[PDB]
Structures are given as C-alpha cells and as structure tokens.
Amino acid sequence: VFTKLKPWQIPKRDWFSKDFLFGASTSAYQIEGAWNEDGKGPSTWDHFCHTYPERISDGTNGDVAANSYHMYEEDVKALKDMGMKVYRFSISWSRILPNGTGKPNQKGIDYYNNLINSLIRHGIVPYVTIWHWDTPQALEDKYGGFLDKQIVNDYKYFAELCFQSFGDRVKNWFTFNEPHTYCCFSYGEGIHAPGRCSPGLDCAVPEGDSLREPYTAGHHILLAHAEAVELFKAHYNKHGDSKIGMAFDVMGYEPYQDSFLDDQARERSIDYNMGWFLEPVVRGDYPFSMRSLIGDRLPMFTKEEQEKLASSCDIMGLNYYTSRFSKHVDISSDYTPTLNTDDAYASSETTGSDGNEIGPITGTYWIYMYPKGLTDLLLIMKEKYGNPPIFITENGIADVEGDPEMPDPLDDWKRLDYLQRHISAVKDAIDQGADVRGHFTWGLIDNFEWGSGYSSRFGLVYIDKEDGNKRKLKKSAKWFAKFNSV
Amino acid sequence: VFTKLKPWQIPKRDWFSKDFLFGASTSAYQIEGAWNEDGKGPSTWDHFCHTYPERISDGTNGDVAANSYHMYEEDVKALKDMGMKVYRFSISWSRILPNGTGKPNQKGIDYYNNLINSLIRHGIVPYVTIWHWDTPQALEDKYGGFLDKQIVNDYKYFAELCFQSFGDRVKNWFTFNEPHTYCCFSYGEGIHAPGRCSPGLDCAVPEGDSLREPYTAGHHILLAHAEAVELFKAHYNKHGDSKIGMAFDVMGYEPYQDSFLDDQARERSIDYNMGWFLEPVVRGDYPFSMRSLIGDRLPMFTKEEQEKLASSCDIMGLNYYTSRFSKHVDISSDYTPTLNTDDAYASSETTGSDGNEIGPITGTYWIYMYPKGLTDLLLIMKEKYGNPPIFITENGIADVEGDPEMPDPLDDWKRLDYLQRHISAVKDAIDQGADVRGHFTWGLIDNFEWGSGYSSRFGLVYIDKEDGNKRKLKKSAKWFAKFNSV
Amino acid sequence: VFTKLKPWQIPKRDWFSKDFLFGASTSAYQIEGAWNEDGKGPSTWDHFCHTYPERISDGTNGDVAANSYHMYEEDVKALKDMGMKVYRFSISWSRILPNGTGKPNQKGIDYYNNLINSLIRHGIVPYVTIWHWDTPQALEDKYGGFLDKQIVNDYKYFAELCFQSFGDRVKNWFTFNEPHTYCCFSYGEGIHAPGRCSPGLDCAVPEGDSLREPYTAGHHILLAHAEAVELFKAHYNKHGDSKIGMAFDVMGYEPYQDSFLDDQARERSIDYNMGWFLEPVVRGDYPFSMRSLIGDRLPMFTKEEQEKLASSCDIMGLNYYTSRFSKHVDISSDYTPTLNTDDAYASSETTGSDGNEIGPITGTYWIYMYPKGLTDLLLIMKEKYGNPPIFITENGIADVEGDPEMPDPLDDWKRLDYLQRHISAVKDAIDQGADVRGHFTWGLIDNFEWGSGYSSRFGLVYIDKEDGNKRKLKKSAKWFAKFNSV
Amino acid sequence: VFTKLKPWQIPKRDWFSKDFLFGASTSAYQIEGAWNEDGKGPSTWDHFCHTYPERISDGTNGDVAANSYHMYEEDVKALKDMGMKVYRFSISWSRILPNGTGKPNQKGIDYYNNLINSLIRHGIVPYVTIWHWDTPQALEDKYGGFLDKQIVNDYKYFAELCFQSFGDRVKNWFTFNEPHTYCCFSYGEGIHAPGRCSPGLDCAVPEGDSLREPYTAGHHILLAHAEAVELFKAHYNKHGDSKIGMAFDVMGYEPYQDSFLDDQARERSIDYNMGWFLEPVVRGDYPFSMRSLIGDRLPMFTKEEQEKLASSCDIMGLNYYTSRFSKHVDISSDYTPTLNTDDAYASSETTGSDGNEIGPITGTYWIYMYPKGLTDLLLIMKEKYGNPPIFITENGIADVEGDPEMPDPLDDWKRLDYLQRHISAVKDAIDQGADVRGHFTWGLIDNFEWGSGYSSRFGLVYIDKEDGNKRKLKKSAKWFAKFNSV
C-alpha cells in the first residue's frame, strides 16, 4: 500500500519560473572510484573502508564505485538526457592534494576541468561542493583532521586551490556538505569515517568523546567556512557574479503529541538539526538552546569570528529526505546525555502519539515520506532567517537491494511519486513567498551509500554493476526527460 | 499628557456575566497595624523595619498602617459603598501563631472571624490569601525561615489552622502571594524582608547568595503549597464547594526588537516571571528554560512531589500591573549571572527598539500602563495552560506623595482611567475565550507599600493619616459605586 | 539609541524583479549653481534668497550649490559607482527660457543634452521632473506666477520645449514636484519662494492670503498639468513608449488615539496631504472632504477640465519621508482656520495618545522614521486608486551640520539603516500586490535644502564644500554599490 | 415570486438567551382614538388631519383608530396570547396635559395606569416612549412647538410628570421616537404634522424652510432629551434599576456601485440617517460630516450641553425596516440643496449599479426586504459606538389594502417570513458580539400609518374595522405563540 498522486496533481515544469533550476547531485567518494590512480592520496573514507570493512553493511567500499573518474562523460550524458540544467558534484580534496597540503596533483585538476568543460559544453551549470566528508587521511594522521585547528588553514588552502583552478568557470559553491550529519555519525555514533565514539560505545574506534568531538569538529568546520568565504569574497569574485554557501542536512519535525512541551521540543530539534550550523552563518553564533544545554562542550567564537560567520552565505542548500516527531525529554537527576544528539532533550520518533508512523516507508529504514515537512522548513527559512536564496541541494529515496517489492531496479515508480510530491511541496512554498531557487535530486546515479554500501540505490539513473557499470535511465529519469521537454 | 478613554469606551457592568466578580485587595502587614497587640508575634517584616528602618524610602513601617486591626468595619463599609462582591485579604501567620508553630492565639482567630462574619453579613465573599510575605520571625530565627525544609511542615500546620478556623465560611483560598516577587526581592536584590543578598551587593544583610537563595526559598514554597493543597482536598473540602490556588505576580512582555532572538527572549521572560511557579502547579516541574540555564542551583522534585504539585490549583490569581520589553542576552565567556533574574538571559527594558517607552507612566517609577499585556497573558493561559479559572487578584496604580501632578489625593482620575482600561482588556480576553472569573483592584485602601512605605498610594479608598486614618472614597471608588449600581 | 536592522533583515537586490528600478534624485535649483551664467534668467528662488537671505537658516543660497552645472559628469559617475539604473533630475525653467516665455536659451538646452547623453552613455535612464518650484521670476513679476491663469499656457509652452528638446531620449516625465508642499510652504506659511502669507503672519511677504493663495496656485498647477499631458499624449508620444506623471509629497498617518473620530481625522489628513493633487489626476476633482470644508476658496473645474485631468498620469511618484499622528479637530464657533492646512480639521502630531513619538528622529527635526507608513500608503494606492504604477521618487534622511552624534559626514550608518528599512517596506507592499516599479533615494548628492540651506545633508554622496565641492561616496553609497553588484 | 426561508432556517426561541426580550410596539396617536374624550387636548396630528385631511392617502384620521383608549384590555390579551414579554407603547402628551403645560388631566393619568397595571398583572414589561410625534397643538399655537426653545422646558415638565406618575412601575423609557424621520417629514418634505416646508414646495403649509427647520427642531429634541435624562438620573432613579434612552429610525446602506466615492457616500448616509441623533447622545455633538456640510444651519451646542448629551442613553432603540443604496453626489456650482436630506450629498437608491433592486418588495412601496442591513448596522454599533445595549424597538412590514396578492389579511405569511429573517439577522449579530437585548415587532395591531392612513396594515394582530375593531390573530401572531411556547 503506497498511494500515488492523482495524474492531475503531478508537477509540470510551467509550475516554476523560467530561472528556477532542476538538477541532480553526487559526491566524489560516492561515484568516482580510482581511489589510488594518477597520484590521488587516500581519504578518511578510503582508510575507514580499508581498515574497518565490516562497518559497511554489504561488505563493499568506494574503490571503484560508479567509476566516474573514467566514465564522467556518461554522467554528463545522463544529465543531458533528463534535461537537467544543473549538476551538483564535489571535489575530492585528496585527489587534488594527495597530502592535504602542499603540491597540487595536475592529473586531479585535469579531471575536474574535463568534467566542468563537458558540462558547460552541454549547457549544464556546475554547482560544486568543496568538501563532502572526503577528508585527506594524511591530515587525519598528521593532527587528527577536523579535531584540530590546523584543519582551518589547510581547508582554506584547499578551497583556494579550487577557486584558482575552477573559479573562472564555476560560479556557485558550497563549502561543506551536511556538517550536522557528519559530526553526529563520524564523531558521535562513529558509524562514519573516521569512525570515532566514546569508550564503551560500539564503533570502529571507541577512543573519542561522543559528547565533545562532534562539537569540536563542527566548530572547526564553521571556522574553515568563514575563512574560505572571506578569502573568496575578497580575492575570487572580481566580477561579483559568483555565489558561495553551504549545504545543510535537515529533517522536518512535528510535535510528538499536542502539548506545549513537544512544541518546545520541536524547536530544540530544529535548532540542533538545522540551527547548529545555519544559525552561525546567519548571526555568527550557535542557537541559544544549544549553548544553554551544552555549555563548555560547545566552543565559544571570538568577536571577529562572529562577524566573519554572520551573513557568510550567498545561497543555502537544504538536503531534505524525511521528518520525525519531536518528543520532549525532561532535564533530571535520572538522565545524562551519552551521545551529542542527546543534548537536544528531544527524541526523534518515527511514530507519533496516536500510534501512527509519520509517513509511508520508501525503502531504506530511515526515509519516511513526509513532504509537508519540507514546506514547513522552507517557511521557517522565509519567516525566521530572512528568506535567503534556498536550493534543495538533495532530495530523494533509496531502493534497497533484495526488497521483494522492488524486483525491477528500473521501475522506480515509488521514487518518482516521492520526487513529484516534493517538487510539489517546493511549489507550495514558493506560492507562499519562500525564496527557493532550485531542486536537485539526490541520486544522479546509484552510488556508494556510505555505511549501506551499494545496497541502497538512490539514483535517477541505474548503474548496472553486472554490465560494466553502464548508465541506464530508470522510470523516474524518463519522467524528468518529459518534464524538462527534452 | 495622559490620554483618557473616550466616554463610549468605558466598561459597563453589563459587559460581564452575572457571576463575574469585582472586588479589591489588601494584605495583613500592609493594613492591619497592631503589630504587637493581643499576643501577636513579630513577623519578618516587623523585624526588617525595626532593624533596617533605612530600607524604607519614606522612613515608615507597618506598626500601625491603616489600623485595620481595629478599623476593619470601616474597610467592609468601603467595599459595600463601592458595591464590591469580593474582598481579597490575607491572614497574618504571626498573629494566629505568634511562634510560627504551637499554641494558637485566640485573639488572632477572633479578629479574622469578626472580619469574615462582617463581610458575610454585608453580602461580601471573602477570598483569603494564607501567606503574603508575612513570615513569623520566630521561624526565621529558628531555622532561617523559607530557606529550610522545616518551613514546609510548619506552613502546613498554619494552613490547617486556617482551614479549621475559617473553612466553614471561607470557600476560596490562595496559598501564597507572588512567589516570584518575593524570591527575587527578598533573597535576590534583598530589598525586602528578610533582606538577604550575595556578599558585595548592597542590601540589609549581604550574607546570602543571590544565585541560590531565591531558588531554595521558591522550592520550599512550592513544596509547602503541595502539602497544604493535599491536606485541604483530603480533609477540608467535605462539601466539594471550596477552591484553593495561588496568586502569581506577572508582567506582560513584548520583544524588544523584531527578531527571532527577542521572540526567544520574551519566552524566557515569561517563563522566569510567570512559569517559575505556575508551570510547577500545572505539570509538576519548573519550565525547561529555567532548568537548562540554572541547572544545579534549581532543586529537583521527587516523583511524588511532581504528582502532588501537578494540577494542584482549582483557581489561579494573576496580579498584573505593567509590562516590559524582553531583550535577548547571549550566553558567553564575557558574562556571568550575579542576580537570580540574570538566569533568564533576557533583560526587562522600559523602552523598546524604536526608543519609545512601552506605555505612559502612572506615578510610581515601575508602573507603565500597557493593558494589552494583560490580554496577551490571559490568552497564553487559555492556549498553553488549559485555560484554568483565572482571577485578576491585583491590578492598579500608585499616586506618589508629593507628585505635583497629583495634588488632590482624592482626584485619582488617572487610576480610574487605568483601571477602566484594564477591566476592558479583561473583557477582550473573555470575548476571545479566556476563562477570567473576576477582577480585584489592588488598593482597597492606601497601605504600606513595602520598600516605598506610604509614599505610594494604591487605594480606591483614601486613608487620611492626618485625620485619624479615616477612610475616604476617591474618584475611582465613586465610579465603582455607579458601575456596581449601588 | 538608534536600533539597526539585524543583518539577516537587510534587503538584497534579489528581493525585487529584474525590471524594478533603483535610483537617486536631485532638482535644478538644489544642485546646479551657475544661477546667472550663459544667459539663465533668475528664478523665484534666486530672487527669494537674494532679497530675503535671512529666511535661509544657515545664511546660504543656491548661487553655486553643488556646481552641477559644471560638475555634472561627477554626478553621473557617482550614479555609475553606486550602480543606480535611474537618475531623477529636474529642468530649470529659467535656464531654458530666461524670460519664462519666448526665446529659448541654447546654452541651457545644451546643458541638459549633455547630462542626458552622458547618462545614456553610462547606461542610466533619465526620469525628468519638468518643474521643481524653480519658477522664472520674470513670470512672477509679470503676473504673479502661479497665482494667475496665464501660468497655465506659459507652463505648457515650457513643457513643450522640454518635449521637443529631449523627448527623443527622455521617455519618463513628471510635470510637477510636490504640489502640496509647494502650496503650503510658498503661499501658506510663506517659508518658501515667493514667500507669501496672510497679513499679520510672519513670512518674507505677508501680503497674501494663507486661506486662498495655496488653493489658487494648486488649481493652476493641476490645469497646467492637464494641458501639458494632453499636449504630450497628442503630439509627443508617436512611439507610445513614453510615460508622464507627477510626484506627490506624502506623509503616512496613524490615528492619534483609538477612536472613530481620529479614524475620520486620518482620512482627512491623507486627503489633504495626498488626495489634494492625486484625486484630481485620478477622477478629475478634489477630494470630497476638501470641497466640503473649503467651499468657495477651492476653485471649481469645468467639465472639460475634469475629463482632461482624470486618468492624466501614466506613472505616479511618491516622495515619502515620515508619518504623523492625525488628531481630530471639531468644527465649532470657537475655531477658525488661519492657514490652509487648518482646513483639514486634523492636526499632525509627532507624539501619539500614549505619549510616545511616532518613530525615532533621524537628524533634521521633521523626519521621524516610520517605514510602516509608506507600506500603508502604497496599499491605499492599490486598493483605493486602481493600483497605478508607483515610483518612490524621493525617500531618505538628513544629517544635520554640527550634530555631535554625526561627527563624520561619510559614516552615515543611520541613513543606510533608514533606506534599508524603507526598501524593505516597499518589498512588503510589492508582496501584498502594490504595483511599485522603483525606488529613488533623495539625496544623490548633498544639496541646497531650501529653507535649511546646506546645513541639512541628504546625499548618498558627500559634497566637500572645503574641497572644491568634490563628490565623495558615503557609507550608504558604498552599500548600494554592493547591493547593485558593481 | 417571494422566496421563503427553508424550514430548518426558521429561528427558534432557544437561539436567544433566557433574558433576551421579544415584544411588539404601538404609539398613542396610532391606536388610541378618543382624541377629544375625558379632557384630552388636541395634538399636532389631530390638528393636521382635521385641517389638512387630504394629506392622508385614504382620507382617514386617528380620531378613533384602534380605539385602544377603550379597548386596551384586548391589546394586552393579544400580547399575552402571542406570549410577548415586552410591550412598547407611547404616552399621549396632550391626553396627560391638554395644554402641553400646567394642570395634569387625571383621566389621562388613570388610563395609562390601567394599561400599565394590566400589563404587570399579565406578566408583561412596559417599555414606554415619552413622545412619538404626538405634540400638544396648544404649544404649536403658542410658540411653534419644537421650533422654539421653550419646547425644551415644557418637554421636561411633561417627562417629569410621566416619571412621577409611572416611574414606580415603568423602569424603561425612550424619550423620543425617530427624530430623523420626524425632522425630515414634518419640517422638510412637510408630509407629516405640522406639515411645514419651504415656499414653492408642495406640503400643507409651505411657509417654513426645508433647509433649516428640520435642524432647528432636531436641535430642540436633543436639548429636551438631555434635560429630561439629567432630571431623571438625578431625582427619579433612586433604586438605580431604571433605564432611559431614545429610539432611532435607521436604514441600512450599501454603496450604490463599487467605488471609494460610494463608500464615502454610504458613510455620509449613515451619519445623516443615524448619526444625526445618535452621535450627539454618544459624544455630545453632531457627526463631523453634517457640521461640515450644513455649517450655520446646524446649531452649535454649549460646553455644558455637550457634556449633558454625551453618554445620555442607558439603552438605544433601533427601528429598522429596510435599506438603500448610497450614491455619491458631487459638491459643485451646478447643485444646491433644497431639502434637508440633500445636505448628505448621497442619494438613497432602491436599485443598485447592476440594475437590481436592493431586495424584494414587501407591500408598501418603501419597504424592500434586506435583513443583512440590520446586521451591518448592529455591527457598526458594536465596533464604532461602544457596543451599548441595543433593542430593535420596531421592525416589520405592511400589507397594503387592496393588494390582490394579499386578499386574506390574516394570511400574512410574507410578514412572518420577513420577521423570521430579521429575528435571524439579529441572531447573526449577537453571534458576532453585538449587544442586542431585545426585538419588538412594529405592528402589535394594525393602526393609523400616518400619511398612509389605515390602508397600510403593520400588525401581528388584525383589527377588523368591519367587526367593531375586534382583535384577530394573524398567521404571524400564531407563529409567535408557538415560538414563545404559549
């Protein structure tokens, strides 16, 4: 039982302005492969899969992935075949600077130049994410990567090299992808590279501090961001036609039960999920709720850092998938936080007070369909944060390998209905004044879904592992081709 | 320049239901006098004036006040002359139990019985406040009064004696008056008996802790309340026609400037001003904001205490005078709280972001006229807290002695306009569904205004200190007489 | 205490459409200088300063002003440096036709052609005001200028010469600037050229009639307008791509106190301030309120004049600075009007019924910041008058010379905050359907502020009187340069 | 074609509160008869019919009418049979004081005492109108009745005699009935006693001034009212349980066409129809619109008169029948007022801009059914005038003698549908907060309809002229009997 839209409710490209942009996304580690070719240095995810292979559900890794290092022309083609106007992809820090720092790798620069030139050549605008969890293992080894201040300057240099190499053609940038997801999973639960967590928790390397490392790393990301954006605006935007921002992972929230306590809980959830990194780029400081609950575990900004962070995004990306119910947790003697996400004192529930799940399951266990959540978030952006330019830089679902209800990987009617419903939810927001400039489906092609390996397929375009990684358009992709009047 | 209502905007008694109740209020220490007659023991306010007389602005005290211990028949008459249906007064703990505990003083009981019987005899319903800051100095001396747990049981015994002595005629009770005002001024700034504050602050007795004593005392008041209400409901309400609650001091708040930060500040102000004691009688715990900011300085409740506090009021009193702008304060390394009221991280401003004061001054420096604030608070009560029965148990203004714009103490047109505006604001609330059952003007008669002595006159009825404390109806009183169709 | 916008509330150029136009304004007399060069005849303001110099606060005049007759290339440059798309300037009637009538002065025509050609050459669109109080003193001397019907035809000829000389390049015109301000100040209080007022009032030439001259002159302006627009539409708009209107001075109004009487007062204020000249260009007659109160002092239109005036504007300019409270005045035996503005029976107050000023002071004594007022006015335009195309043709503030809170004339953060707030108020209007096509800041450069001389600085661009009248960008100007992505 | 309510839309007595009052009305001249018995002096209407009989359409007069001077017991019975709780009737000034002034006529007092005692005896509350156009012809002859100041004191004495004679039983009074209708028809068009109008107009006595007499008489009525109410409140309301007001004739208005000009016209219509006499009892002065348009023809009030008039009604009666479209009239040289009602510069139209009549005709030519109009008026009362206690003191329709669509005078289904629709419109008002305390149908019994004689039948109860003036319940009356659960 998965009810689809009625045909008269399906979005049409006319619903959006001529300038509104439709696209799809990927990230380096997830599609490139070639993890050690042409000089590329290893990344924290190379290292994490190569030393803790058992932390990937289906026992796979990103050594080869979709082989987009060699097959990128096929990716471009799939965009052109769907009629997408934008391609959001990321640059592999360790491919461009095998040691994190120092001598740039020409073969690395060349690769991106080729992808970029192919896009332009096919009328596709590149939106480039600078860092997508893809951190050079040399810097992890040298000083513990994002847990050390030195990452700030090193990131800055990396960002600069990107601006120098590609800034004449690439005019839209995201410094960082999903800092909240990264901090929670990489340093809190430790299910993602470098795999750290508190002693006694179960993760590859339980030698960290699930109550402090996530904040330390978060803090360094925001300082890095501020430095890079300052560098950019000052010396790399001489025509003024370039925009730079960051992409935030966000979940919608609804109060678990009707009570002023869950209303307050919902606000703490959104602060912790979204405001953790968005409020600093807006006002130059973390949300009050977080400071009040986290105190000394949450680093203080200097005056100049506040000023540098505030108003540091020209554009903001929102990666939206699902929503949760926020259920209030009391502060008491009985309870002490053990994971960073406990500091919100609001637990994310998949079922609400009436016993019902928030929305239908879509395949992988964490993605419940709730398009209203996106609309609500976009309206918070409009009303609370100044209605800055918003791009849905990720949105989509997974078909899980082996699911008997998805036997033909190309017949992704479920993904199509989901994407249509959310495209429509973005229209609702726009109609109410939200300033949403674009929609990028996450899943250009099936790729390496971090801890789920390839067993989770997110693409519009199938990737046939049995047929040389060939790109094959799924039903959803074919719909975009009509939608975009190809 | 003080603009009055247009005559067609003045409330009429028809505006309210037949059952709605109009009355006036006083408290023992403020009007009784006779501080050491017929066996009465000394109270913390006797002691505070007698040992720190310089902490009263005009150098006066409550030894005699309005002499209502002897002149109570005159008070009753003034109520009857205005046509009030309700009289809200308080019982002097130290007059009924000179040692706080132990042997009751018959002359004390007799006094109240006489007032009560006179009221009933004149068709006036008594609403009795059990404790109004009026704490027996024997218990202050014995164990530090409200700073010790022992106050809980001792209060309970006091409350019980009241129920036994007067419960057959008195059917409406308030356990405590303005716990927030009391905790802030008595243990925080220390301007009110027993006059405690942190070392280095300026107050009679700077040997306390402005960051902890206010909470300790607040905590004991709520435990006392819970015990008394449990005792009451169990053994002193055999007809089920008696109601018991508490009266809260409340100020309205408006965000200082239009920003989501002052919106959050306003919520913290209301939590700290109102929710500090109201949320515990509602859900059995302090507001989340307070727990998050105050942590270990704010005592924890036991399970059974939660359950006993929750739903412990049948009726709630709101003492409303004025409003403020709430201005957000950041949590930072630079700032540390020194007074308990700093823990809200929201400063109360009298002027907003546009440079304007919130409303017109009414006489004494802290009462700015802002009736919209009351309406807003009543709507929070309706929407957030279950819309429980609300009585405006205090509301009014002061004429300041010596103010050249108030040369004739009987010509209180300003007070009348203020009261009319607020009676009207209560009507607005009722029209929107707020469950407001009554309005009690604070100021039956001019009385001892704590740290301002008599220099602040709050009464509807003047008290001529030069003419033997004679009761004389002011303009406002005369208006109530017409309003109530006397 | 002057609270600024939070950084996330600051307008961005994206807030408005691609076709929306940002610009700045000036007027001939206020910036040109060269009052007697190349044949220019004297104007009523030359005459007024030269014979009544003491009526200018700081003892200055417009003989030289910003010397824009010679330095216009610098003005164009300052527009280009801020990235403005529009320049609103006025043509000096007495420079083009030294005798008001008759032989045109080539050097005069050449000057404007040069300014116009420079603008076009720099991608800046000229919006030209034909008359800006700038009336030829030959016509004042000959028949009393706007107080005689003959001004109608003479204005017509002037307008025609402008259309012939510049109509091939200038496609947007305003016939008259602020007729209400002009009539009130020039013929009512008499503080502006020609300085007339009733006998016994204090003004340069108290030989007029403050109850009749303002209307007579107003009436002649509207007839002049009608004739010029008829001439234009008939013989000077052969491509149909030209638009012609007028610019109105307007203040926002709020009822002084909450009462249906001040509601009626507010309507009379807006009628008298705005509707005096706007209702005639809309329906061909003065507002009913004015006719009912002014009777025989307010000239009647002929049928054909009604028809010619009605629908005579393609575009309307609104010069907005501030707002007032409207306080009702009764009609009675006690009261008789003495100034034309008394005929509204509504006094403009700077403080409302609660004692507060309407908004913060911005420098010069009459400009209180109240952006909501503009939004309200634009919504009246939409809802009541057909939502015709509206340009904010003036808006801004003054820094007063010698104000100790504005020691550095370039650090005009206050002006910047004000302009940002109003740009934002225009966005609010647009979002609600108001048809606002553009925003012109008054103050391209500091200039001669009529009766305040240069002591009032309104410019985005400073004019250094000590440094040869050099143009220097202030903080606000620099912000527009970023805003316009220069 | 007259569409009736669906049966589920018919009001039920449950729709209104227990205290809401249903009743019916009459006036002395219209039902009493006995115009010269037991000493009664002649009234202006005796005189007007006896000297200008041709001004009554059907050639009849009120010499005998319904003979209620003798048959009043039958009127009481008809009220009791319908279950009405209230009876609104008027006292004949000339029956109680045959010379207007001086010696009271006992037989006159006795009559009213008997009616009053019968009502009370049958559980019916009397609401008494003191003057209902019924003016003693001795005072007309002596000084021209309401056109002379002397009427003020004389009315006062009359009112006093009523208070003395009946005030112990009658607790609700209306000083004057429909002053607007009276002034317009009696002194403007002159179709009603004393029949005055300007020379050259057609009315019995064209020796008056249709532009001044209506105002002079109106002015004297308001002064009379003020004096009487002051006398009453001071010396005739010793229990405070008596209420005194006036009844206003009111028509609903809708703008003729959608334009801000007809919006302004509608406001002038309501001012002139309703505000003419209501605004003075509210704020102590005529509406601003009227003063501005009427100037010197509209008498000025003294300070003390303002204060005495303001807030002079405890209750207000509204006599509602129908509505009109208000169509704007320009002030111009072409137009001059000739009738007082021209001074509104808004003509009352029966058909709107789309060509449709406002509502269905109900019998007599001026009563078009438009219940929405009443609801709107009641909401103006609530929102603009303080929401004072409102009684619909008249409401109903006429069956015209000889109308072929009303052959059986008892089968008044049309009246019943109309009354039901308006009872329902009053419910709508109440549901929206209007303070409407009662509904009195005009037409207890058919009576003398002034200039239409008996040919217009307004009663719930038929009066059989062919069967000795016997009272016979019509269909509508029978419905009230069920409605009131008799």
Ligand SMILES: COc1ccc2c(c1)O[C@@H](O)C(=O)N2O
């Ligand atoms: C709960 O497991 C996940 C929750 C959120 C994420 C995840 C895994 O990995 C990718 O799908 C991703 O882009 N985010 O944001």
Ligand SMILES: COc1ccc2c(c1)O[C@@H](O)C(=O)N2O
């Ligand atoms: C700021 O000074 C005061 C503020 C509030 C109070 C006060 C003094 O004393 C009494 O007027 C009172 O009932 N409260 O609530």
Ligand SMILES: COc1ccc2c(c1)O[C@@H](O)C(=O)N2O
């Ligand atoms: C109250 O003094 C002024 C009020 C309005 C104006 C003025 C002076 O001169 C210029 O600033 C102007 O453009 N107007 O509209």
Ligand SMILES: COc1ccc2c(c1)O[C@@H](O)C(=O)N2O
């Ligand atoms: C237009 O003719 C009339 C208009 C209004 C009235 C009238 C006659 O006589 C009675 O029906 C009455 O009570 N009024 O108000």
